[PDB]
Amino acid sequence: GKGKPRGLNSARKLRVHRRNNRWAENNYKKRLLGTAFKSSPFGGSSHAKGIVLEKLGIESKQPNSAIRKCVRVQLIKNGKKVTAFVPNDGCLNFVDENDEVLLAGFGRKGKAKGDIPGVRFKVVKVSGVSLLALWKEKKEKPRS
Amino acid sequence: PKKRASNGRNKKGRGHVKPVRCVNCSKSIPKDKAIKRMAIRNIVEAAAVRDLSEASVYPEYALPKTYNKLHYCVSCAIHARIVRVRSREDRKNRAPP
Amino acid sequence: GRMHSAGKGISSSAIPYSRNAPAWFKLSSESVIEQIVKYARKGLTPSQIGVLLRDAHGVTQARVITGNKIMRILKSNGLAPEIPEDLYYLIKKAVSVRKHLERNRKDKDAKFRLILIESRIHRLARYYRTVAVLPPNWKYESATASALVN
Amino acid sequence: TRSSVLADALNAINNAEKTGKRQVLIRPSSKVIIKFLQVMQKHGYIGEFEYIDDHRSGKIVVQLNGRLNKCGVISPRFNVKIGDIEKWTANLLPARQFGYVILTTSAGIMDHEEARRKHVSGKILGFVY
RNA sequence: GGAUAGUGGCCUACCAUGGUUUCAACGGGUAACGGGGAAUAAGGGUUCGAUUCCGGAGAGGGAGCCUGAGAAACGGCUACCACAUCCAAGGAAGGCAGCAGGCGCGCAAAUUACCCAAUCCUAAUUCAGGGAGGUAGUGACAAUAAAUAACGAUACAGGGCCCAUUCGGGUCUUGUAAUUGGAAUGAGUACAAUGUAAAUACCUUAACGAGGAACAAUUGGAGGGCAAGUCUGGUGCCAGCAGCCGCGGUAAUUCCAGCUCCAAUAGCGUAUAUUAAAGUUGUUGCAGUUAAAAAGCUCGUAGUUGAACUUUGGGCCCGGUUGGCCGGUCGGAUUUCCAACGGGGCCUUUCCUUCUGGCUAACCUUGAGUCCUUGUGGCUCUUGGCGAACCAGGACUUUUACUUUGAAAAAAUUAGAGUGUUCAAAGCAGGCGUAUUGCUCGAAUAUAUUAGCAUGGAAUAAUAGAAUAGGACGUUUGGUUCUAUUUUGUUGGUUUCUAGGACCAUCGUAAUGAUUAAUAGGGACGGUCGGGGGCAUCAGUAUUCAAUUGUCAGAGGUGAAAUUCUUGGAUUUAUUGAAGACUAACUACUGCGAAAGCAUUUGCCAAGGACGUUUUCAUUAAUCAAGAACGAAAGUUAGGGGAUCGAAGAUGAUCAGAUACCGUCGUAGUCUUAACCAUAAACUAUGCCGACUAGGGAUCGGGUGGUGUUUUUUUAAUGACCCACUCGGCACCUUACGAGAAAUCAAAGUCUUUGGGUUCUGGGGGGAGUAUGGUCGCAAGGCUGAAACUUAAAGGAAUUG
RNA sequence: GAAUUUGGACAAACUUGGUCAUUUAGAGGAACUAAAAGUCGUAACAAGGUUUCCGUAGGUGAACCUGCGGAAGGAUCAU
RNA sequence: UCUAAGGGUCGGGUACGAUCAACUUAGAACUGGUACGGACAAGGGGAAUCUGACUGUCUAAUUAAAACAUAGCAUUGCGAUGGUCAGAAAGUGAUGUUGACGCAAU
RNA sequence: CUCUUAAGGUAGCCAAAUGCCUCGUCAUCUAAUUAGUGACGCGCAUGAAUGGAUUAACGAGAUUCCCACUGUCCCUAUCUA
Structure with a gap:
């Protein structure tokens, strides 16, 4: 009879089987309590702030070959040292040593993105202004 | 949560039977697998049959045969013995010649 | 199916459609019960008695020949x-x-x-x-x- | 252990039908089965049958015709609430205009249209088309 | 029983030993007060529910308390704790989870604004007070409508229409034009009014307010997915883009720019969370021979599931909802007609609860019947029958699950009737006048699973009632108990009958009471069946060693060499002995066992299958978390045994290296005793029980029959054969009727025409069957068993090459 | 009828340990993961040149090798 | 200063009355300058490392230990015309009133 | 790759009661540590019954730290025989 029970008074056994067998998706723990809050860099949050420890040049994965220009951002709440990408061409030139920044997820719900190994957070804002604005030269980096 | 992996493919037998070592190379092997041949030859060859018959005391004589059952290890069977390898259809057939 | 063994046997004893009858049968209702009682006294099971009467003498089945089963018949006369x-x-x-x-x-x-x-x-x-x-x-x-x- | 005699009977019937026959020795009968066959016979899906009798079991030999696409059983026999039978008809039947979800209520064993007309419900047994 | 406002282990004195629990208690976690509901939904569902109605509230954390009908209040006290306010250092005052406001956190969120005009509430109260509330400002959280340009004529080319009169003019329209003109606006300012509590806005409104350099639209993209460049300049695996696949290494349809174009448009991206997609959670509805998955095997409690069988039917009436002549009415309906659909009665052995009954009601009631087409289509009366139609009561009427119908099912929200919000989201309004001191329709309707309640139904599914009858009726007949309103003369005492309470007694009536015996299960019995198991006991050969040996130079060993042992007779034949070793050949798509696994003889000890069976039992059962027996080989523990083969080891070769393959020895082991051990590619990597579907032979084990053949003692009996048949197996051959991704499959079939019962496991690969914690084990290890982090494929079948 | 005491329950609070949960430092050790071109060999996939693999025990710079039993996912469906 | 609970023997016209003894244990009041095992008697405890396992033994007059010993393991020789040892020899002796699961030596 | 032995220290373990150099270097205990403890180990000169390693229990053994407690000490005073 196709494995599972088809008793009229079973129900219990069915629901318990589901409760057992539901555990096969990382997203299932997110809905109960949150893996984000116990482990993980971003504490159940979309974006996260931090301070730039150092500028980095990451070797891209094959078949690609380049140096990707990233930063070790130590966060403010948790204090975890996390790698982070710098979007657009140049833009590593705008950021300095020990500046407040704002990070966001790279796109793929955690995890890597394309040829970049390890890094999973794109930089959005630096010293209270967007990278995009700095790049296009609409607004400038406030020194004071 | 919970997540892992793998397994594989198939053939038929019976239960268990004891092995009989390879007559050539001393590898162990059961008897559903086996690969066996009956060595049933005369002591004398085709060349020797006359030279003997001539020198034979007793009229009619005898000329018996050395009988023995030889068991191979599949590996060794293909090394020499009549087994070789057959097509997709021919490997279903069981007739000897 | 079998409760423990792997076997799938159906070696069994098919009663005929005849509930009344046998028609060919002779004898009375008292004789058979008496016989039953005798072998009960002798000290045998409902099964063994049922065998012995059936094979050696004329009882086809206890319910057909009387109006009761052997166990009940034993119980009634205090021999169960x-x-x-x-x-x-x-x-x-x-x-x-x-x-x-x-x-x-x-x-x-x-x-x-x-x-x-x-x-x-x-x-x-x-x-x-x-x-x-x-x-x-x-x-x-x-x-x-x-x-x-x- | 046959968990449902009716089930197995229906299965046998369907097998025979698929094979393309006109007869089935089905076993070991029930009043329910008989009623089922009264419904089916009523709506043309089986030719006139003969319940044979050995005391203990009671077998049947249904002379089925060939109109039958598929008869089948729904175990466990669920409880149905009039508003629900639609969903069943939507689900398991081929079409709206034909096919009969047969079922048991306190009135008796019958097709779903009859139950609608009567305006009662109870359990579900199976389906025929 | 105090205390309470009243109940109760609320609280204890005394006494008891309970209460709860695999139907998941108790404990732990919660980024949890809850619901009404929100997101999204074919149906089923999945996620979220902080955000003006209840004991738990809670007023920084607790604990205590007066006042009062009401408080364990906090815009009230009391203390302690943590922090923190001001001093003429003696001492005083505090609590913001009501508005203003914002340190660190941040991913994230506003004026120390004006007013009780609404809306309400409180006060002795229309008169005061209310940061409750309203009003704005802040406001791209969300929603609604929504400008950014329109239009001629001219310069060209078309296309449809009117006179259907020729080439005559046209109402016109579809475009393109460094062809050129008048027109129409809102943003915006704003006399003014309106608006409001008073202002700002908006709805009106004079006045000024388009010609592009203006009153200027962005945000993404342009290889595919996925709408749009085989354009230009730069760049040279550099910089960069790229959710995914991939672009870039000297010609970039992807980068950095231009140009052009395509979407969406005052918004568009981007991040994380979720829903659909997702049948990648699977009840509906998945997968498990390999793609990820069936526990080694069997037992076994819980749970789930579980053969049939018990008024079926056959009649006779009654009235409904439907079909249609008749439209005898003027595209409205009536009443008698053939059938359907389910109803309601009464009869066919059918209390289909009632017992005491009044109304005894519908009536053997009929006192002389009539304004009827005789054929029974039907308004019409007269003194007096059967208890539910109305209530009065009581006697006892398996116990539910299921389902119909009903209320009870707060509002906003949801679906949704109406309606000028200038349309629309919305809102609940409004419409109409004889706009003379008036008239009037609305603010419906539906939804509310589960449980609780009443209420029919009685099929299906459970469950009791008569089997050493303390069993139902009862006109029987003693009796033993207990009760009793009225009356005897009244309130009371004992009494007689009297009516009923139960209990017991022998007689009295009923066909006096026991459903089958499931190609379900168990059990006995029958002669057979087997390399099934145990306990011994017998044989066999070889292998090695020894003695006797008979003998004579090379014997072992490989691909070839070497180690090696060799007249201190070696290898080698014959005669014996000793020790363990394993059951050859026969031995097979042969046999048993639950498996692991078991082959010499013989005996003893129980056990088991199939079969036979007009034997018995009578649903006893199918699978099964927990728990439990067995469980190869290798290991471990202490004895034995210790011949061959042989992890380690030594070695001689090999080779660039060889501690590997090839050789010559060789300790643990291989064997066994008593213990452990629990894994295996424990493999038919195919759960078990049940049913049903295709043919064909062959075989193991019973059984049936045949004037069959064969074998003795021609003949009898069996055995062995042959033939035909049938049961239970180890299996096979041929198709695919079907199934499948195929390979292949008689079961992997009867599954999108998706449900016979049940257990277990899997949800991309790795990380990892690791870590930790439990648990078993002497140990080796075993069972149970994650995480961070990483990655676009791993993989499975086939197809070429 | 105020201070003020006797007893009592209700008891915050601190001192002490016992805990259950959640985090977090740490010399050093041992893993895993990724990262265009790092050394050593070449262990599987063709009979990968000794057929693979499974269990278990030992050995070895490293893949691995060896034993006993098993399987075939074999290089054989076969007298 | 009380209460309770632990028992012995005698009794039945063929359920329990009478009495006799101890000490133990508990519970309650009531009470004192909160003292009460009142003097007397009578354990400091933990976290670790080193070392030998342990109880035991010894330098009687400086060393009590980590030294010796031990159980357990391993080894060796020995079948009595024997092994290990004694004796000046001895018709001598210890192991031995022994026998390889024993004796001797490590 | 090489000289070289009878073989070249294996499993373990350590500045250990075994390590000169040494107060080894790193961590921990403290205000501060040639003490102790955990690590590291080409160990002058560890190491397998000349027994190696681990240990529950025991210890008039050797060692360090902590709680408790003290005239040991600051800082000496007093009383009795």
């Missing part, structure tokens, strides 16, 4: 045994097996068989206790097994 026949037989088997095991040591299969038999016995006990032909809070056990054979 202390416990059910089949269960008793099983117990007897089990005791014997245990005895056999006692003399041996390295044997395994017979132990397994014993265990199987014990299971069966337990199941039977559950049944009889449920319908209340044995006493409630009555139980078979290994220690007082050979005492129960009497």
Whole structure:
């Protein structure tokens, strides 16, 4: 009879089987309590702030070959040292040593993105202004 | 949560039977697998049959045969013995010649 | 199916459609019951009696020939045994097996068989206790097994 | 252990039908089965049958015609609440205009349209088309 | 029983030993007060529910308390704790989870604004007070409508229409034009009014307010997915883009720019969370021979599931909802007609609860019947029958699950009737006048699973009632108990009958009471069946060693060499002995066992299958978390045994290296005793029980029959054969009727025409069957068993090459 | 009828340990993961040149090798 | 200063009355400058490392230990015309009133 | 790759009661540590019954730290025989 029970008074056994067998998706723990809050860099949050420890040049994965220009951002709440990408061409030139920044997820719900190994957070804002604005030269980096 | 992996493919037998070592190379092997041949030859060859018959005391004589059952290890069977390898259809057939 | 063994047998005894009859049969209703009672006195089971009468004499089946089954007929005249026949037989088997095991040591299969038999016995006990032909809070056990054979 | 005699009977019927026959020795009968066959016979899906009798079991030999696409059973026999039968008809039947979800109520064993007309419900047994 | 406002282990004195629990208690976690509901939904569902109605509240954390009908209040006290306010250092005052406001956290969120005009509430109270509330400002959280340009004529080319009169003019329209003109606006300012509590806005409104350099639209993209460049300049695996696949290494349809174009448009991206997609959670509805998955095997409690069988039917009436002549009415309906659909009665052995009954009601009631087409289509009366139609009561009427119908099912929200919000989201309004001191329709309707309640139904599914009858009726007949309103003369005492309470007694009536015996299960019995198991006991050969040997130079060993042992007779034949070793050949798509696994003889000890069976039992059963027996080989523990083969080891070769393959020895082991051990490619990597579907032979084990053949003692009996048949197996051959991704499959079939019962396991690969914690084990290890982090494929079948 | 005491329950609070949960430092050790071109060999996939693999025990710079039993996912469906 | 609970023997016209003894244990009041095992008697405890396992033994007059010993393991020789040892020899002796699961030596 | 032995220290373990150099270097205990403890280990000169390693229990053994407690000490005073 196709494995599972088809008793009229079973129900219990069915629901318990589901409760057992539901555990096969990382997203299932997110809905109960949150893996984000116990482990993980971003504490159940979309974006996260931090301070730039150092500028980095990451070797891209094959078949690609380049140096990707990233930063070790130590966060403010948790204090975890996390790698982070710098979007657009140049833009590593705008950021300095020990500046407040704002990070966001790279796109793929955690995890890597394309040829970049390890890094999973794109930089959005630096010293209270967007990278995009700095790049296009609409607004400038406030020194004071 | 919970997540892992793998397994594989198939053939038929019976239960268990004891092995009989390879007559050539001393590898162990059961008897559903086996690969066996009956060595049933005369002591004398085709060349020797006359030279003997001539020198034979007793009229009619005898000329018996050395009988023995030889068991191979599949590996060794293909090394020499009549087994070789057959097509997709021919490997279903069981007739000897 | 079989409860324990792997076999799938249907060796059984097909009663005919005839409930009344046999028509060819002679005799009276008192004679057969008397015969039953005789072999009960002699000290045999409903089964064995049923065999012996049927094969050697004329009783085709107890319900057809009389208007009752053999067990009931035994019960009526105060000759029904202390416990059910089949269960008793099983117990007897089990005791014997245990005895056999006692003399041996390295044997395994017979132990397994014993265990199987014990299971069966337990199941039977559950049944009889449920319908209340044995006493409630009555139980078979290994220690007082050979005492129960009497 | 046959968990449902009716089930197995229906299965046998369907097997025979698929094989393309006109007869079935089905076993070991029930009043329910008989009623089922009264419904089916009523709506043309089986030719006139003969319940044979050996005291203990009672077998049947249904002379089925060939109109039958598929008869089948729904175990466990669920409880149905009039508003629900639509969903069943939507689910398991081929079409709206034909096919009969047969079922048991306190009135009796019958097709779903009859139950609608009567305006009662109870359990579900199976389906025929 | 105090205390309470009243109940109760609320609280204890005394006494008891309970209460709860695999139907998941108790404990732990919660980024949990809850619901009404929100997101999204074919149906089923999945996620979220902080955000003006209840004991738990809670007023920084607790604990205590007066006042009062009401408080364990906190815009009230009391203390302690943590922090913190001001001093003329003696001492005083505090609590913001009501508005204003914002340190660190941040991913994230506003004026120390004006007013009781609404809306309400409180006060002795229309008159005061209310940061409750309203009003704005802040406001791209969300929603609604929504400008950013329109239009001629001219310069060209078309296309449809009117006179259907020729080439005559046209109402016109579809485009393109460094062809050129008048027109129409809102943003915006704003006399003014309106608006409001008073202002700002908006709805009106004079006045000024388009010609592009203006009153200027962005945000993404342009290889595919996925709408749009085989354009230009730069760049040279550099910089960069790229959710995914991939672009870039000297010609970039992807980068950095231009140009052009395509979407969406005052918004568009981007991040994380979720829903659909997702049948990648699977009840409906998945997968498990390999793609990820069936526990080694069997037992076994819980749970789930579980053969049939018990008024079926056959009649006779009654009235409904439907079909249609008749439209005898003027595309409205009536009443008698053939059938359907389910109803309601009464009869066919059918209390289909009632017992005491009044109305005894519908009536053997009929006192002389009539304004009827005789054929029974039907308004019409007269003194007096059967208890539910109305209530009065009581006697006892398996116990539910299921389902019909009903209320009870707060509002906003949801679906949704109406309606000028200038349309629309919305809102609940409004419409109409004889706009003379008036008239009037609305603010419906539906939804509310489960449980609780009443209420029919009685099929299906459970469950009791008569089997050493303390069993139902009862006109029987003693009796033993207990009760009793009225009356005897009244309130009371004992009494007689009297009516009923139960209990017991022998007689009295009923066909006096026991459903089958499931190609379900168990059990006995029958002669057979087997390399099934145990306990011994017998044989066999070889292998090695020894003695006797008979003999004579090379014997072992490989691909070839070497180690090696060799007249201190070696290898080698024959005669014996000793020790363990394993059951050859026969031995097979042969046999048993639950498996692991078991082959010499013989005996003893129980056990088991199939079969036979007009034997008995009578649903006893199918699978099964927990728990439990067995469980190869290798290991471990202490004895034995210790011949061959042989982890380690030594070695001689090999080779660039060889501690590997090839050789010559060789300790643990291989064997066994008693213990452990629990894994295996424990493999038919195919759960078990049940049913049903295709043919064909062959075989193991019973059984049936045949004037069959064969074998003795021609003949009898069996055995062995042959033939035909049938049961239960180890299996096979041929198709695919079907199934499948195929390979292949008689079961992997009867599954999108998706449900016979049940257990177990899997949800991309790795990380990892690791870590930790439990648990078993002497140990080796075993069972149970994650995480961070990483990655686009791993993989499975086939197809070529 | 105020201070003020006797007893009592209700008891915050601190001192002490016992805990159950959640985090977090740490010399050093041992893993895993990724990262265009790092050394050593070449262990599987063709009979990968000794057929693979499974269990278990030992050995070895490293793949691995060896034993005993098993399987075939074999290089054989076969007298 | 009380209460309770632990028992012995005698009794039945063929349920329990009378009495006799101890000490133990508990519970309650009531009470004192909160003292009460009142003097007397009578354990400091933990976290670790080193070392030998342990109880035991010894330098009687400086060393009590980590030294010796031990159980357990391993080894060796020995079948009595024997092994290990004694004796000046001896018709001598210890192991030995022993026998390889024993004796001797490590 | 090489000289070289009878073989070249294996499993373990350590500045250990075994390590000169040494107060080894790193961590921990403290205000501060040639003490102790955990680590590291080409160990002058560890190491397998000349027994190696681990240990529950025991210790008039050797060692360090902590709680408790003290005239040991600051800082000496007093009383009795």
